[PDB]
């Protein structure tokens, strides 16, 4: 039906906004970004980065072995004997 | 899952089997024309 007059019911809330032409669109971006970027990344890093780290180890090891076992053509069993 | 299971429901299931049972037969008939089993043809 109608999506704007019928969403929900909201009592007692004031909002205050300003016009685009009165304000700046880039509010101390370097300054906010660093600290905000920093503050969320550091709350992400722990939850996100691990598994990727893990994959990297597994990638690294996993390729070493291959090259070894295959390049170590004598790996399985020695030559002299 | 658990909510669906009930002591009361059984009559519907029994009724469903016949309609379901009847429905099942149709597929065999439907499949068979396409399948064309020599054995099915032999039947």
């Amino acid at each position: 039906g109608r999506q704007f007059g019928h969403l929900t019911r909201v009592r007692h809330v004031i909002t205050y906004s300003l016009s685009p032409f009165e304000q700046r669109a880039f509010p101390h971006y370097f300054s906010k970004g660093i600290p905000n970027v920093l503050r969320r990344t550091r709350a992400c890093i722990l939850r996100v980065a691990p598994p990727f780290v893990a994959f990297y180890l597994v990638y690294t090891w996993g390729t070493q072995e291959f090259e070894k076992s295959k390049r170590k053509n004598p790996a399985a069993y020695e030559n002299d004997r | 899952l658990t909510r669906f299971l009930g002591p009361r429901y059984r009559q519907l299931a029994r009724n469903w089997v016949p309609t379901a049972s009847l429905w099942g037969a149709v597929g065999a008939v439907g499949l068979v024309w396409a399948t064309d089993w020599r054995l099915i043809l032999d039947w």
Binding site: Q3, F4, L7, T8, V10, V13, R47, V48, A49, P50, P51, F52, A54, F55, V58, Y59, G62, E65, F66, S69 | -
Partner: protein, 379 residues
């Protein structure tokens, strides 16, 4: 009303789902992948129709045909390399989409989730047949080994693989079939997309917090049209960056070799989008066991609704799932890696534990974590 253009035409009212619609305020950048998703669908199509304006679907020519599109035809080269690369994007975008749904519980919208799933799988078919159109060594073999992987089914299989191919191998018969279905899928898929949109319009867009926003809703026109245009801008960026600077980079396959049915690249594998599927098949010794488990990879999506255990549809407030969500993603990356790996011990053993990890993450870990978090919050 009088002369309110929008609701005058009934048709033009239907378009006010873009402009006037209630859109939540708060909203990660992640949601731009919906829109971009469509973007990609439209780009492939325009691109496809021009390539299929100079492509032929025969054994003899197909390779030549593509080769001719990239050489003698004016701006056919970019069109084709834009089309190839696009499809990468299309998938890169798809998998962001489903990530978001996984993480914030957008999948609560069961009906929307089930369409998504169909969407995903339909594109999946599309991508599988298009890559075979050019009829090059990778394509040729990839079709055989996938299609044949259907012959695992005991009673039918065998007969059925032969119907799909239109014969005993993959000669002309198969090659023209893929051309026709590749062509017609995307059109059918657009209908689906719109059907998907339809259902979603009935409950609006979930948020990072995970709570209803009805108390905070914004104009889609004012705000979300620029966001979406901006999204594009970055999307295109990636598509041209790829297409202009490293055309082949992302297109692992270097097999620009006309397909010779006795010849074989010992390293046969699907593309990045389908890389995960190939890996799943490998961990199971048995053929049939591998086909089931391949289907379940993808088809396991539609379970997750039922698996949901927490009281917070938002993972945002539940650390533990945020950790296992990420891991699945990195497990998914791990699997993609296997895909381009010799099928030998090293990779086998790895893939096998990754394929169990993926299904654990989805079937068992997350669901429990949900509960836990709920119990720590005293919920």
């Amino acid at each position: 009303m009088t002369n309110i253009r929008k609701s005058h035409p009934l048709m033009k009212i239907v378009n006010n789902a873009f402009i006037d619609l209630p859109a939540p305020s708060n909203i990660s950048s992640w949601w731009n992948f919906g829109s971009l998703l469509g973007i990609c669908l439209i780009l492939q199509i325009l691109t496809g129709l021009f390539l299929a304006m100079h492509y032929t679907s025969d054994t003899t020519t197909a390779f030549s045909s593509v080769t001719h599109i990239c050489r003698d035809v004016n701006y056919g080269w970019i069109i084709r390399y834009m089309h190839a690369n696009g499809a990468s994007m299309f998938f890169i975008c798809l998998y962001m989409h489903v990530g978001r749904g996984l993480y914030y519980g957008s999948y609560t919208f069961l009906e929307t989730w089930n369409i998504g799933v169909i969407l995903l799988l339909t594109v999946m078919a599309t991508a599988f047949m298009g890559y075979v159109l050019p009829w090059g060594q990778m394509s040729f073999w990839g079709a055989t080994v996938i299609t044949n992987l259907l012959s695992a089914i005991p009673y039918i299989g065998t007969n059925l693989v032969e119907w799909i191919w239109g014969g005993f191998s993959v000669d002309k018969a198969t090659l023209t079939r893929f051309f026709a279905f590749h062509f017609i899928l995307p059109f059918i898929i657009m209908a689906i997309a719109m059907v998907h949109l339809l259902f979603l319009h009935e409950t609006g867009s979930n948020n990072p917090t995970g709570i209803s926003s009805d108390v905070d809703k914004i104009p889609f026109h004012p705000y979300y049209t620029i966001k979406d245009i901006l999204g594009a801008l970055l999307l295109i960026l990636a598509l041209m960056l790829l297409v202009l600077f490293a055309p082949d980079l992302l297109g692992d396959p270097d097999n620009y070799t006309p397909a010779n049915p006795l010849n074989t690249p010992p390293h046969i594998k699907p593309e990045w989008y389908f890389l995960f599927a190939y890996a799943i098949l490998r961990s199971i010794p048995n053929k049939l066991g591998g086909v089931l488990a391949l289907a379940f990879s993808i088809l396991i999506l539609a379970l997750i609704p039922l698996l949901h255990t927490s009281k917070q549809r938002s993972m945002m407030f539940r650390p533990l799932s945020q950790c296992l969500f990420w891991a699945l993603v990195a497990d998914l990356l791990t699997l993609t890696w296997i895909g381009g790996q010799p099928v030998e011990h090293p990779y086998i053993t790895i893939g096998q534990l990754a394929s169990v990890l993926y299904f654990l993450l989805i079937l068992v870990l997350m669901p429990t974590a949900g509960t836990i978090e709920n119990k720590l919050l005293k919920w």
